[PDB]
Amino acid sequence: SMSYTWTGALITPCYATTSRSASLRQKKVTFDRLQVLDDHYRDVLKEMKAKASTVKAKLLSVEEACKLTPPHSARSKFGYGAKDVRNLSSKAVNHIRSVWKDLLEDTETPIDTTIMAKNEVFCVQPEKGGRKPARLIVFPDLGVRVCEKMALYDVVSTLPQAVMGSSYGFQYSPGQRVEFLVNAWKAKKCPMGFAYDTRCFDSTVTENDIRVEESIYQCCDLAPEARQAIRSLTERLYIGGPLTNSKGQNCGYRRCRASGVLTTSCGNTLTCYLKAAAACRAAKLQDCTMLVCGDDLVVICESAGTQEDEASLRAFTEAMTRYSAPPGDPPKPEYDLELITSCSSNVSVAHDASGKRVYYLTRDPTTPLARAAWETARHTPVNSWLGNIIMYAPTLWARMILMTHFFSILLAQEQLEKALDCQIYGACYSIEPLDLPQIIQRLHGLSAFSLHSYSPGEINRVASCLRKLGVPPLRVWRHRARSVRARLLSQGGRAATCGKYLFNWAVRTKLKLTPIPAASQLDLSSWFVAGYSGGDIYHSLSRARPRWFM
Numbered sequence: 001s002m003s004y005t006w007t008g009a010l011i012t013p014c015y016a017t018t019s020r021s022a023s024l025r026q027k028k029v030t031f032d033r034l035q036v037l038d039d040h041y042r043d044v045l046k047e048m049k050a051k052a053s054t055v056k057a058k059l060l061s062v063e064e065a066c067k068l069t070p071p072h073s074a075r076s077k078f079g080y081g082a083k084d085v086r087n088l089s090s091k092a093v094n095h096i097r098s099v100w101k102d103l104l105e106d107t108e109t110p111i112d113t114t115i116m117a118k119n120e121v122f123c124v125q126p127e128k129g130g131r132k133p134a135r136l137i138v139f140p141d142l143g144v145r146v147c148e149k150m151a152l153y154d155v156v157s158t159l160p161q162a163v164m165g166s167s168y169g170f171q172y173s174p175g176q177r178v179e180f181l182v183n184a185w186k187a188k189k190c191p192m193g194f195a196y197d198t199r200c201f202d203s204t205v206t207e208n209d210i211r212v213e214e215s216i217y218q219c220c221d222l223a224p225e226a227r228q229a230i231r232s233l234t235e236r237l238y239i240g241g242p243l244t245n246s247k248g249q250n251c252g253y254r255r256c257r258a259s260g261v262l263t264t265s266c267g268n269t270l271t272c273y274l275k276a277a278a279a280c281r282a283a284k285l286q287d288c289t290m291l292v293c294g295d296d297l298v299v300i301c302e303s304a305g306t307q308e309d310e311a312s313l314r315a316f317t318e319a320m321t322r323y324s325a326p327p328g329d330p331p332k333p334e335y336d337l338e339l340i341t342s343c344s345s346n347v348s349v350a351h352d353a354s355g356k357r358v359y360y361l362t363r364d365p366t367t368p369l370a371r372a373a374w375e376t377a378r379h380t381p382v383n384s385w386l387g388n389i390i391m392y393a394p395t396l397w398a399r400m401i402l403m404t405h406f407f408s409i410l411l412a413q414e415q416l417e418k419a420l421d422c423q424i425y426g427a428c429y430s431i432e433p434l435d436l437p438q439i440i441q442r443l444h445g446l447s448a449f450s451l452h453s454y455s456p457g458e459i460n461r462v463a464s465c466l467r468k469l470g471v472p473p474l475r476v477w478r479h480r481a482r483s484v485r486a487r488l489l490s491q492g493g494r495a496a497t498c499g500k501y502l503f504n505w506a507v508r509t510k511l512k513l514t515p516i517p518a519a520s521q522l523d524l525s526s527w528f529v530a531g532y533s534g535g536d537i538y539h540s541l542s543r544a545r546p547r548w549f550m
């Protein structure tokens, strides 16, 4: 069937992407799907289902689902918003219960969704091609979104790890992700790795793929209401349904993956892993190790020879293509771990204070810098700069440019204690900048504060990027950081900890740096568990048992 059909009504609004480029994207994502399954597919599926059978899922109460709703989440068209939901207002709660009852009673009627163009900031690079069109977001009403959490929050948080095990990428912090990749690479006699990029993955997801995902969720121990809600949500929402623009006009119809449903990440991860694990068998790849994050797939295997590796890679592609997962860019075999770009990141190595080797994840900093620039210029709902500091804390660019620049602004605005929202693995987190030393110590280790001996390739990439974007050179940043550090140190408490730990690199005479005693208390239990892209998930960071002296 067609992934999408359009009435012709425009995708109306609500360098950066806008609704004007939405037409160009619609042409790309609108196509008929051709899917052929085989024995490898069926075998992998049964193996996945057997592991899913060990899961016991819980039905979330109305109160629990409401607290998971972001405060700025889209308002319902039924006279209430995210604030009313979080406060457990009578109107919001009564509507949610009516939506739930309707899922238990109605098993067939398609549920309405809103289609909208995403406004994301990308960089002005005219050296190769032109500006990329806006990505599209498809989401149901706020009421349907709360019910999705009640039925599937515990499923989508628990089931992917039980099924895929160590292959589930969202169970890893950036440090654990590097540990997984390095251990996998060094485990092979002669290693070969590749990244597989699917052209419009959400559009390649067929209605059978969605029914197959349900067959996996149905293996959980579920409360009868959860079982019926999952069944009704599959037929009425996940399989497809009608599209409505921001103005209320009928836009068309969807028969592929919705980007803004709770099961988007989980379903995409399961589907990608299933087709890839089956394709690995068809291509007859040796001792495979996979790492899957939604549509992002990386495979580390045992090399069979340059010509053989090229041949097996074409065979994997032909299998993936049959499964309705064709590539955008054809996959390339890599014989260095540092040469693999996975989740827009690559492995690099530095040294700690004692000269010991330390692996970390980095990336080209063009887009993180351009987005941080937009964020200082115009106040945005999500602060990509904060998330980049959290995720890329051990990197040369996040320490010298992002940390320095934003701590100087927070010092000037007297907003260090002010909690800001950032997206990590699709979920929204309300974090206070003062908590950054503690967070970094937990996700990356004490070493992240005393890392040095960066590679020539990494230094040159950071330096070239700064030149290309008109950003002052690294020496200017070291000078600015010494002032930021001094001002922070003088303020005491958590602010001094920010100066001492985050800007230790900026001083000629480096400090000892003992572990931060309060970092243990940080409740990070809901941090590197699962992916919730388009899931509309929110968590405010909390401290467990605070000591009076902290």
Ligand SMILES: O=C(O)/C=C/c1ccc(NC(=O)C2(NC(=O)c3ccc4c(C5CCCCC5)c5n(c4c3)CC(=O)Nc3ccccc3-5)CCCC2)cc1
Binding pocket: 369, 370, 371, 372, 373, 376, 401, 402, 405, 469, 470, 471, 472, 473, 476
């Ligand atoms: O000795 C030498 O040979 C050269 C020395 C040298 C060169 C330039 C400066 N610039 C400055 O002082 C000013 N800009 C900055 O001190 C500045 C700070 C951050 C900047 C950023 C980002 C960096 C990441 C966090 C968010 C801000 C961008 N740009 C920045 C410029 C350059 C810019 O203007 N815009 C962009 C656009 C896209 C991407 C990055 C940038 C402030 C007043 C006058 C301009 C300072 C020293």
Ligand SMILES: O=C(Nc1c(OCc2ccc(Cl)cc2)cccc1C(=O)O)c1ccccc1
Binding pocket: 173, 174, 177, 293, 294, 343, 344, 345, 361, 387, 388, 391, 392, 423, 424, 425, 426, 427, 531, 533
């Ligand atoms: O979580 C981040 N990005 C996402 C993602 O990460 C995969 C991934 C990327 C880099 C590392 Cl080091 C490790 C894993 C997979 C799915 C969804 C999202 C998302 O957009 O929320 C995110 C947040 C702040 C900086 C950078 C990335």
